[PDB]
Design a protein around this ligand. Sequence first.
Ligand SMILES: CN1C[C@H](C(=O)N[C@]2(C)O[C@@]3(O)[C@@H]4CCCN4C(=O)[C@H](Cc4ccccc4)N3C2=O)C=C2c3cccc4[nH]cc(c34)C[C@H]21
Length: 378
Amino acid sequence: GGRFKFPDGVQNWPALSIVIIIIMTIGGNILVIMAVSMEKKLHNATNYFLMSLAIADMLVGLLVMPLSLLAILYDYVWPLPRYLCPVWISLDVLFSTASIMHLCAISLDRYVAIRNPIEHNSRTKAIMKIAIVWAISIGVSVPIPVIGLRDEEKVFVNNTTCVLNDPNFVLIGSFVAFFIPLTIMVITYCLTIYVLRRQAADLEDNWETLNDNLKVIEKADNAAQVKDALTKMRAAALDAQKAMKDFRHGFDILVGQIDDALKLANEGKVKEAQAAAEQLKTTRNAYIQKYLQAINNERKASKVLGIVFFVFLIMWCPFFITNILSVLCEKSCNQKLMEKLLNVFVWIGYVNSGINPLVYTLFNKIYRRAFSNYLRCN
Ligand SMILES: CN1C[C@H](C(=O)N[C@]2(C)O[C@@]3(O)[C@@H]4CCCN4C(=O)[C@H](Cc4ccccc4)N3C2=O)C=C2c3cccc4[nH]cc(c34)C[C@H]21
């Protein structure tokens, strides 16, 4: 009666339990799609892009993970019809790349928004980005149907197991789908953290000059000395202002005290100006806390960026690196262990798709309360 498998030919039940992570991925992104849909605040362009990413990652857990689970259930013997594997593999390359490409764009956008925060029809650009991202991924995926259709031996080999059999594609696909985006995310990340640290140093330097000039005002006795030190603060305040409205307004109201004290410093006596430097001391200490919460925001952003980039490396690097070694190293490297590692590094890349939502909820207050409400509402 032929050679059957399903629904009881399962050879590995311990692997079945791994469904747990699958259930987390599908729902994890659904909550994001809910947040961007229900919440009025999350109708921002960048959030629509996170939704697109969520669509990519959700489809990974929806269409790629379950079929890889069946593959493990039957000890890597394809139980489904033959035509359904090249379909599976192509989807694997598609959504996985879409996930990567999306992540790369997020890095780029975050750099621009950090460099020149003056940015705010605004949706047409986001639509343009989503389209381009999905267009590139499709390009990376179309070789699968092409190669598979023009030769059956290249998708599954022993009339049993289904695995890529074209080393040229593996090299190219890996190089263009991961290593080029990786290079962009490396340089991008480095520039972003550089800009961030430079902005922090600027605020700290402006605050130091505001203190040092006050000390030397209380110190010396020359009316022109008070004039010089008292004028250098006016610039240090105007420069720190352009670097939360109560803070810039604090620099604006203390500037007025620098005007009064500077008027009484040239035509008046040094003692009265030094007495005005006291009122300046108090107006500075009034906002010393708002200065600390500003620099704290700087260090917070630095940590979040370092996390997301680190996670991306830890997740996708093992697969693609070993994938490269498995093709271009056909002798020196151990091949049996290579397959043993790749089998796990594949699902590590999968887990990244489920980590992305869990990442953008741990740090955003709106997503935290949005998730905490979607889980308890139903
Ligand atoms: C996670 N997903 C997995 C998928 C894949 O390899 N899936 C199979 C089914 O799993 C293997 O790794 C297994 C594990 C152990 C032995 N295996 C192999 O030998 C061959 C790889 C290989 C072929 C020839 C020579 C050396 C190595 N495998 C396979 O075909 C390809 C991906 C990919 C390749 C290229 C560009 C890409 N963009 C996004 C992606 C992607 C997503 C990304």
